[PDB]
Each structure stands twice: as C-alpha cells, then as structure tokens.
Amino acid sequence: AFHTHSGIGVPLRRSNVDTDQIIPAVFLKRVTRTGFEDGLFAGWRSDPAFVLNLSPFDRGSVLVAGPDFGTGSSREHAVWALMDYGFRVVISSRFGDIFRGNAGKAGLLAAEVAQDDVEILWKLIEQSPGLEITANLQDRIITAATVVLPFKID
C-alpha cells in the first residue's frame, strides 16, 4: 500500500539488471535471521567503487536504474531483497514484467520514467550525492531539486 516516499537517491547506471544480479541464487539457501540485505547486488558490492559502497548512497532508499531493470522471470526474493536493504522506490525506463507485478504486491514502487528523465535524475544525484528523491503516487510525479518528472505504474 505505497503512497509517498522521500529518500536518498542512488544512481545505478546498469542496464538489463537481472534477478540473479539483484539477488544471487546462493542467498536463497544461506542461513539468515534478518533478510537478504547482505545479498542485494552482492556480486558488485565487493568492489569499493560500487555505488552502494559510496556514502551517502549506502543509506539510499530510491534506486535510479538503467533500462530493463529486473528482467529474468523474477523471484519474489529480488523485490524482497531490495526492500530488506531499505529501498522503497525503484526508477527505470522499463521493468521486467514479473518483477513489476511482484514489486506492486510487496509495496515496492516500480516507477516507469522516460530514459531522458532518468538521465536528468542521474546527473542531479551524481552532482549532489545525498540529494533526496520523492515519489508521489497520487499525482504520479518524481521530484528532486527543482525538477518534477512524470512516471507510470502501468
């Protein structure tokens, strides 16, 4: 039951991020009493330069990603891993269909935004890391700094 979220935006310039990149399959069988926060993007997180390792993106809760986010006959767990880490909004110019449905059910907003608009968001948050992005479901807008960009959920 999403309604409105404001949080630190995270610029992930990766395209075709599949569900095995979001949550590698080994994590589905590794004992954990909290959730999958430590498996989220675990393959990329070993590199200190990876965006989520950078402060303040580490505490981010709005993910701004490249095209085709969550391709790969999803697992509910990919959405759940994003949420466990703290994300409540993911922005992309196109989502995997099954990921999309899972995101809605779980309360993760999958906001579809035109690629040129995604670019605007990337630049803003790269230029001022820590910049908050706000998603408003009722009005269907993403706002950040002095920009107000339209999104769809279908």
Side-chain angles (χ1 to χ4, degrees):
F2 191 91
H3 161 346
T4 185
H5 184 77
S6 290
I8 290 162
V10 175
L12 182 72
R13 300 182 173 258
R14 288 224 45 144
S15 302
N16 309 123
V17 171
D18 64 38
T19 52
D20 276 342
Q21 296 173 332
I22 297 161
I23 182 71
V26 298
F27 290 95
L28 276 46
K29 304 207 265 192
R30 284 197 176 161
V31 165
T32 176
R33 292 178 164 86
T34 55
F36 285 180
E37 57 276 9
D38 301 337
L40 175 65
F41 296 139
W44 290 325
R45 282 164 70 177
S46 70
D47 179 359
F50 181 62
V51 68
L52 263 194
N53 283 328
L54 305 185
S55 171
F57 301 141
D58 67 307
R59 279 177 286 113
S61 68
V62 180
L63 184 65
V64 189
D68 300 296
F69 189 82
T71 46
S73 72
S74 171
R75 300 220 168 79
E76 284 153 325
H77 310 82
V79 169
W80 294 341
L82 280 157
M83 296 195 76
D84 286 342
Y85 190 86
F87 286 98
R88 298 285 179 269
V89 178
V90 180
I91 290 154
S92 179
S93 47
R94 186 155 56 204
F95 293 94
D97 338 35
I98 290 164
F99 180 83
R100 245 265 227 247
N102 285 158
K105 307 178 185 191
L108 176 66
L109 175 66
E112 179 185 318
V113 164
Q115 186 54 31
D116 288 347
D117 283 347
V118 173
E119 249 311 325
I120 287 169
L121 289 175
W122 277 336
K123 303 266 224 328
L124 284 176
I125 60 196
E126 296 169 339
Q127 164 182 27
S128 307
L131 188 69
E132 283 192 350
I133 300 175
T134 291
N136 173 340
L137 185 55
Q138 177 84 186
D139 290 309
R140 305 296 169 89
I141 56 176
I142 304 309
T143 66
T146 68
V147 107
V148 176
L149 311 167
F151 74 83
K152 1 215 205 182
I153 62 182
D154 53 24

